[PDB]
Write a protein that binds this ligand. Sequence first.
Ligand code: MG
Ligand code: ZN
Ligand code: ZN
Lengths: 1138, 142, 227, 99, 293, 96
Amino acid sequence: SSNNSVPGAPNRVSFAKLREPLEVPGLLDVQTDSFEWLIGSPRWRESAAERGVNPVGGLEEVLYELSPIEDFSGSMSLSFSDPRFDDVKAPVDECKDKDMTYAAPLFVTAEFINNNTGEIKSQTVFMGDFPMMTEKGTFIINGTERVVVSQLVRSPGVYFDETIDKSTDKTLHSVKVIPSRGAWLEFDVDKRDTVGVRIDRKRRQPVTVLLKALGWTSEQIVERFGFSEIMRSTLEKDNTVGTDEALLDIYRKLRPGEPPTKESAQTLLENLFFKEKRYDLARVGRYKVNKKLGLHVGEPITSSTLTEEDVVATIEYLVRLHEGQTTMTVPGGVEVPVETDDIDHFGNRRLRTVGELIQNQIRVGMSRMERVVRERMTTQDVEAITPQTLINIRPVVAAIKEFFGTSQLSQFMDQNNPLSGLTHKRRLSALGPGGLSRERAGLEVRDVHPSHYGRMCPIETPEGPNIGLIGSLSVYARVNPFGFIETPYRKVVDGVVSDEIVYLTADEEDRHVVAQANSPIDADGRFVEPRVLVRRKAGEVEYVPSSEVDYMDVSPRQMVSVATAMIPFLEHDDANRALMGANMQRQAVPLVRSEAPLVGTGMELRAAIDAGDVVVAEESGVIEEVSADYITVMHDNGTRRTYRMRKFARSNHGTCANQCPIVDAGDRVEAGQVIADGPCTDDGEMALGKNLLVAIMPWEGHNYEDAIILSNRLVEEDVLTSIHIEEHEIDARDTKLGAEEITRDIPNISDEVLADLDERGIVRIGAEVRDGDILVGKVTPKGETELTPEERLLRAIFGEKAREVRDTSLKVPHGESGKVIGIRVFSREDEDELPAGVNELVRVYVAQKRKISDGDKLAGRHGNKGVIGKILPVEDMPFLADGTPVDIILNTHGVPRRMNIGQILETHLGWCAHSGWKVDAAKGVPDWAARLPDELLEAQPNAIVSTPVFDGAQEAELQGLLSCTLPNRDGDVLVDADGKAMLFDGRSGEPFPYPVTVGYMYIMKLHHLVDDKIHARSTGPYSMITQQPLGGKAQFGGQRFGEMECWAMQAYGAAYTLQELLTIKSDDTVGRVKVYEAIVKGENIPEPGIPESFKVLLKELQSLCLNVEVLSSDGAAIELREGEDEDLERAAANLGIN
Amino acid sequence: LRVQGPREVQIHLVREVQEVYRAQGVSIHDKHIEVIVRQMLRRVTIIDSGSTEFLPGSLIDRAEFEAENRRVVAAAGRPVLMGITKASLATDSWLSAASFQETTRVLTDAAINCRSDKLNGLKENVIIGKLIPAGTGINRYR
Amino acid sequence: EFIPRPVKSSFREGLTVLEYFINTHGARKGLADTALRTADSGYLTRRLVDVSQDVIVREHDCQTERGIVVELADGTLIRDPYIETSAYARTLGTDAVDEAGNVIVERGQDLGDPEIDALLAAGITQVKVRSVLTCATSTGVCATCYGRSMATGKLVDIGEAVGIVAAQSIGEPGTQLTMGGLPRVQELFEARVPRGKAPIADVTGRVRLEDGERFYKITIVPDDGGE
Amino acid sequence: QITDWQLASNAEHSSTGLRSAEVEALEALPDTEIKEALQALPEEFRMAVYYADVEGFPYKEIAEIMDTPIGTVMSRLHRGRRQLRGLLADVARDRGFAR
Amino acid sequence: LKRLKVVAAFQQSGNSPMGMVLDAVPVIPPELRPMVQLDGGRFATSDLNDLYRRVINRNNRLKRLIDLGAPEIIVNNEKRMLQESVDALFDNGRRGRPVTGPGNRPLKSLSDLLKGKQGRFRQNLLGKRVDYSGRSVIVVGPQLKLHQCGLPKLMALELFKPFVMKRLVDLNHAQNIKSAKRMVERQRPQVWDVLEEVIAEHPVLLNRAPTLHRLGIQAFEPMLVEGKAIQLHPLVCEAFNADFDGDQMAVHLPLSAEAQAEARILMLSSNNILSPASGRPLAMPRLDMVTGL
Amino acid sequence: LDVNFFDELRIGLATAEDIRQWSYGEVKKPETINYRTLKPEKDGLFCEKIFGPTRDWECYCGKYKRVRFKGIICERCGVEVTRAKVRRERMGHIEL
DNA sequence: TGCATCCGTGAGTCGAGGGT
DNA sequence: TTGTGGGAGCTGTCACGGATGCA
RNA sequence: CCUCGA
Ligand SMILES: [Mg+2]
Ligand SMILES: [Zn+2]
Ligand SMILES: [Zn+2]
C-alpha cells in the first residue's frame, strides 16, 4: 500500500493482495551492466569481484587476445595493457548543441620488447576518442541522442534439427557447429545413406574424409562407428582411404582452381578450426557444447576452440540421433540426452548487448591495426621504432565511428515521452549483422515462445512488419554474463514458500516445476491446497502437488514489460487491444500541464525515475535555492549539488521536454527523492494523459466508427494542449558559381516582407511566423543566363551591378506556424567546426501551442483508439444532474466487440476515485470488502490508486465501491451502483431516457495530429530523373496514384481522368506548364503530351543495347526530341514587342 | 480438358474456385470467375503443322490458329489450358509482358524475335500516356 | 494445436497469468498470419488483373444460343444455396415455362430478384442462362452474355472493362481466406497438376479394382472394346 | 536511388532549384507591371532598350539592327532607360531594386 | 525445337546474331544517372556511374597492357575483368559475386532499373505521383449528404490555387497575376469568399488505400469545412473499408471537362451504391444506424 | 511536339554501328567532376562536350553565355550552346 | 538419354520523419 | 620500389518450373 | 533502408 521504498513518493493506495518479495531492478541495468563491463568500471569491478574473482573487462579481453603481437621471425613483440580513460571532452548539452559526439579519450600501455637487443620501450598510447554512455544509458553521436538495442542472436554451440523430408518422405537430420568467430562446420544426411561434412558452403564431402584427415585411420574410424551402419555404408561408398590423401582432398575442395599441396593443406586446416587466431568458440560456445555432449564436466573453460574429441562426439551424436536413442555416452562422456535443439528456445537464443556489440567492432578495428603493426615492424629501422610508430589508430576510430554511424542496432532514440525512451533501451531486436535477416524472418521466430515467460514481454510488439522481431525486456528480467536472460523465482522447499530469490534461465527452468504468484499461501508460508496449475517443462500446464514444486513466481507482471504493466485491468483485455495499449502509451505526447491518472498501477512512479527524464536527488539535503532554471541542495555533508533544468528542449520526435521543480526552498529531500518533474511526469509518476469525464453512448453519429467527441472545455482549459518545437536548419556554402551569403538583401522582395528579420537576415527572436515567412534570408549565385527578362531589365535600368543571385532563403513550411524561441548560428569567420565548403550555419527553433483539434488521435490504455470527430460547445454536451458536462463521449458499439472491457472497469474505478468513498464499517466489514486493505475502506475525492495487473481490484470489490461513493456538494449520488447516470441532452434539454455509464477514464494524446498530417499540393518540385512530383509532405510532394488506383480508374472506365493523372498532373513537362497557363487564363485544359518517364524508359533500354523505336502509322521511326526554338514569336514579343 | 472438352473444363474450374470461396462464406458471382477462366482456354497446342509456318508444340491463339489456317488451304491443334501467369507472359504485347514480371527474359526474347508491339491494350496505352481502349476512351464514345 | 487445457476464465472475471500467457500464442500467430496472407492475396490479385485486363465488352450481343444450366430447387421444392452467385443477374437463354406452360420469364431478361421469385413460385427448378464461358464474341465478350452490370443494376454498357472488375471482385475478399483455401485458388488459377490428383475415367466401360496393400490398381475395359 | 529529401537538400544550394510548373507558367505569361511600363515607352526607345538590356546585343550590333548609327542608338538607350525608370518606380520598390 | 526457336527467330528477322557481342557499350545520359552534393561535402551518385567507371578503368588498363605488350596471362586477366564489369553494368549479380558499394550492397544495374515494383514499369509508368492532390485524416461528419465530403479550407485553397488566382484577378482583388499568387500565399482574407465560389459544384476524387476495388476511389462534391480533417459520409465507409481510428485519405482534383464529367457521372458517390462484385448495395446503415432503427 | 499517336513500338538488337550512331562522343576518362570547381571533366562521365551543357546557353570555358549564340559549337571547348535539357537525352559510348 | 539437382522466379497498397 | 605475407560475412524462407549437367 | 501509421 505504501510503496515507500521510494522517498517522497505519492501515496498510491493499492488493491494488491499478494506480497512482492523482490523489487523491480534498475530498468536501465540491461544497458549499464553491459557498458560498465566493456569499460571495466569500479562499479562493475566491485560487483564482478563481489560475485564468485577472475575480473576481466571487455577492453581488457580485447587486449589480451591481441597481445602479444609477434613478428614473423619471433624477434620483437608489441603488447597492450591497462585500458584507462581521460575525462569527457565536452558535456552532453555541449555535444547536443555543437553536433558533437560525447566521448572520452582512451589510453593503453604499449610495451615493445626487442629480444635481439634486449631493450624494452613502454609508453602510454592514445587509442582514440571513445564514445561514452550517458547517465540515461544512451549515446550522443554527432549531436543526436541514440540507443544501441540488444540483439537476439543464436548462441555459439552445436545444434541438431530434424528436417522433415527431402523430395522423398525420408526423415533427415542436420547439425551446424556455429562459433562466436571463425568458419562454419556442418554435417548432414542425404536422401541416400551417406554422412557428409559441408563446410563453408563447399560441396558434400563424406565425413570419413575428415576422420582420416585428423589422423583417425580406417580401422580406428571403423571401431567407434561400428554400431552405426550409416557410417559403414559411407566408408564402403567412400572414394579413397588414407590420412594424407584425405587431407589433400580437403584442400582441393576448399580452393577452386588451385594446385593442392600436402604441407600447405596441413597448416590451413588446423588454422580453420583449431588455431585460436582465426577461430574461437566463445566462453559461452565452449560451455554450450561441453554441456551438450558432456565432455569436460570439471569447468576447464581455459581453452575454447573446436577440438577433435568434440568433433567426433558431435558426429556420433548426429548418427545416433537417427536411431533416436534417448541416451548417449561418449568416451569420457556423461549420459547426455540425444534430442533435437530448438533455435527459438531462450537457452539457445542469447542476446548481444551494447558492450558486446561494441567489443566486436573494437576487435575488428584492433585486428586491422595489428595487420598494420606487423607491416610497420619491417619497413621501419629497428632500435629506432617506438610503440607510437607501430600503432595506427585510424582503423579503430573508423570501426567505432562506423558502428554508431551505420549499424541497424544504433538507433535514433525514440523519445516521444519518458516511456518511449525507456522501453527503447530495453528492446530486444532480431534483425542485424550476425543475426537473422528479414527475408529469413519466418512466422515461427515471431511467435511467443514458451521460454519467453518472465524474459520477453508477450504483449508489447509492433503491429506492422516488425511483429515478433522487436520485443521488450520483462520487468524483473536481467541478462547474465553469457548473454542469456534469467528471471527470478522463489525457492519452495517441502511446500513452504521462502524468500530466497533464485534467478534461472530457460534451460535451468525446464529442469524444475514453477507455480504461480497468485497461489494460496497460509500465514507460515505453506501451500494451502495440494494440486494447482503449474508450468510443466517445454511450456505445458499440469497440476502436480506442492511437495514437488521447486520454484514460484516472485510476482505477477513478471512476464510483462514496463509499458504493458502500466495497463490497469490488463487481464480483462484481449492480447490484441492490450498490445495496442502498450504501443500507444509510447506515442503519448507531453501536455503543457501533466496529470497523473486517478486509476493507475504501481509502475508509473518506478518507470518515471528510471526513464531518467525526472530530476532525482543524489544525496539528502535541504533546498538552498530554487528557480525555474535550477535547484540547489545543501547536503548535510556541507557540500552543494545543483541540477539545471531542461527548459523547453526539443526531443528527437519534436515533443517538448520541459522539466519543472516540485520542491520548495527549505524542503528536506532524501536520497533518490524526485526534485523535479519531466515531460510526462506528475510528482514523480508517469503521467501520459488526463483524467477525462466519459460517457459511454452513441451521440448523433459523431462518434461513429471509433470517432471521438470532445467537450470544448479541453480546448479552453488547455487540458489536451501540447507544445511542439521544430528545428529549421539552413547553411551557406560554396557553389560552382560563387559562395552563398546569409543576407537580409533578397531579390524581388518588399521591405514589408522582411519586416521581422534582424539586420543579418535571420528572423528575430520572439516573432510570430506563418507559411512562407522568411526565417533566414539566403542568396545563391546564379549565372547571368538565369536572370529572367524582367529581372534583367530592372537590373540594367537601375544598374544594380551586384552579382545576380537566386532567392534561396529558408521559409516556414506549408501548414506550420509558431513563435521563434531560439536562434543558433555558426560562422566560418569565427573558428567553428563546419563541414567542407560550408560558411554559415544557423538553426531557427519554432514552437507551436497545439490545441486539441478535429482529427487528432486519442486512446486509453486498453487499445481503445480513435480520432476526434467533433469538439462540441460545453452547452451541447450531455451533462449530469448537477450541470457538469461530460468531457468525452466514447461510442458503445466499440467496446464489447474488441474485448477491452478493462476500459469499462477503469471508468467505474475512475469514478470511485474521483468521488471518493466511505465503506460502511459499522456492523463489521462486509463480505466483499473482506480482502481489502484498511487503507482502502475509505478514500477522499480524487484519490490516487493502483490496479496491479493480475493482482488488481476484483469484480466484487469494485462493485462494492460503487455503492459507497461519496456524494457531491449537494448530497446527490450522481452515479448509481451500476456505474450509470442520468444525463440531459444539452441541445434540446430533454433527458436521455436511459442511464448511461459515466466515470473517469485516462485518455492520452497520441502523436498522430492533424497539423502534422494535413497536406495538399497544386504544383511543386519534381524529381530530376523521372520528372514526376517529389514524395513526402516535407518536400511539398504529390500523392502517389499507384497501380491499384489505376486499376480502379480503369474499372470505372474513366479514360480521360486516368490520362490526365498520368500525363499533365505528373509527367508531361510541357503540358504541366500549358495547364497552369490554361487555368489561370480561364481557357479549356489542353491535350496531353508524352510522359517523360516513357522517354526515360526507352533511354534505359538503349542503354541495354535494345534498339527500341516508335513507329508512325505507316511511316518510319518517330522523332522524340523537340525543338531548340519555341514560342519566340509570342513570349519575347509579349512584353510590348512586335 | 482432353477428356470432356473445354466447355466442361470451364464449368469444372469455376465450380472448384467458387467452392473454395464458399467454404469461407464469400460471395463471388460466377461471371467474374468465368471472365477469368475464359482467358485460360484461348490457345491451342500444335501437334503437327501440316502446311503452316507454326512450330509443333507452340501455343497459338485460337483465332490466330484458325484465321491463319484458312488462308493456307487456298494445322493439328489441340485445346490447351494454361495458368494465368503463363497466359500473361505469352501476350502479343511485349511491353505488357515486360511490365508484368520476369522483365529480363521477356525483353531478351522480344529483342531476338524483333517483336513489334501494336500498343493495343489498356496497360500499353497507360504506359505511353494514350487514352485507354475502354469506357470513355473507345472510339464510338470519344 | 489446441492446448488440452482451456481458459476457464472469462474476461469479465479477468484471466490468470498462465491463461493470459497462453492466449498470447494464438493472438500473435494470427497477427503474423494476416501479415503473410495479405501479400499472398495481393500477388494473386495482380496476376488476375494482368491476365484479364485486356477483356472488354465489344458488342451488344453475339446472338448465340449456347449457355449453362443452373439449379433453382422431399415433397416440396427447396431453394438452391448458390442461386445468388450463379443464377441471379444472368441473362436467360431460354424462356422459362412450367408444367401447364406459362411464360414466367422471357429469353433475354435480367433474372433479377422479382424474376427469380416468379421463377421459384411457378415451380421452375432449372434455367438456361447466357454465360461468359459460352460467349461467341471474337475478342472479349458481348453485353448480353455478360449480363447486368453489378454496379449499375442495368445491363452492362458497351465500353466496360469487365476483366479488371472481375479481378478486383475476386481479389478483394481474398484476405478472408484462411486454413486448401487461397493455396487451392492459386492451384486452380495457375492450372497446375494438383496435389492428391484424383484421376478420372478416360473412356466409358467397366472397372476392375485390384486391392494391394497401400497400392490401388484401377483398370477400365472400354464399352467400345478398345484398348 | 537518390531520395527526394536529397534532391531537395541539393536544390537548396543550387542556382536554379526544383522549379514548379506554376513558376514556369508565370514566367511565360506577361509580367503585367513590366509589359505596361514597356508599352508606355515610344516604339524606338522601347526597341533600343529591349535589344540592349534583354538581348545583350553589343552596341554596334544593335546599331546594325534598327538601321541607325551608334550615337542614335545610345541616346535612345539612355533616355529610354531614364523614362522607364520614371515608370516602374513602384515595381523597383515592390521588388528589391531600391536598395 | 528449343534451339530452333532462337535460330529461326534470328533468320526470320533480318537482324544478325553478331549483336549478341559488343565492341561498343552505350552510355545513358548523365541526367538519368545524377550526382548531387549533400550536407557534409560528400556526394551521392547513382550506382550506374560506379559501374560505368569500373568499365572505363578496366578498358583503359586493358589498352595500357595491350600497348605495353604485357604477358598473355595478364592481358587475359584484364579482358575477363572488362567482361565481368560489363556484366555488372548490364545485370549485376547474375553471374558470380555482385559488385558491391559501401556497406556490402549490390549496385543496382540497368536491369534492376526495370524489375519489380521499384523499376520504371511498376513505379513510374503504371503509377505515378500526381499534382493537384492532397491527403489528410478522415473524421465522420454525419451531417453530410451522400454526394458530399468535408474538404478542409487549407486543403481546398492549395488544390484550387490557380482557379482562385484567376478569380481573384477577375474581380479586382488582385491587380495582376503575381499579386494573385502572393495573395493566395499570404492567405489574405479575400481568397476565402472566392474559394467557395470556385469550388462550387467542382467534384473531387477521394481515395483510401489499399484500393481493393474501384469503389476505393469515389467522387464527391466538396463542402468547405472548418478544421484540418476530411469529413467522410458514414455510408461510404463500407466501400472504403474506412474506420475513424486514424485512417487517412487522399484527394485528387480533376481539371479537364472530361475528368470532371467522369467524376460527376461515373464515379459519383451516390451513383455507386452497389458492390460491383455482388450487385448488392454497400451503402446501407451500419451498426449505429442499425441499433437506432 | 509529338501528337501522341504512335502505331507500333519495336525492339531489335542494337548493332555496334547503331550504338555509335546514337553516341555523341566516346567517354574516355573515369573522372566525373573536379573537386575544386565542381565542373565536369572533359571526356568524362559528365563531359559537357559530348552530353551537353550543365547550364542553359553556356559553354564550358565560358566564351559563349547567351541565347544570342544559339546552336553554335564553341571552338575552344567543343560544347554546344543549347538547352541543358539535352543532358537527359544524349548518349555516349565506350569503344572496347 | 534419363532424370536429379540447381537455379532463377515471385512473394499488398498508401503515409510520416531520419538523412551514412 | 626486396628476409613474411589468403576477406567478411554467411543460412533461421519457401513453392514452382524448367534448364543444366552428370553418368 | 530503419522505426512507425491504417
Ligand atoms: Mg483503421
Ligand atoms: Zn456473348
Ligand atoms: Zn568554350
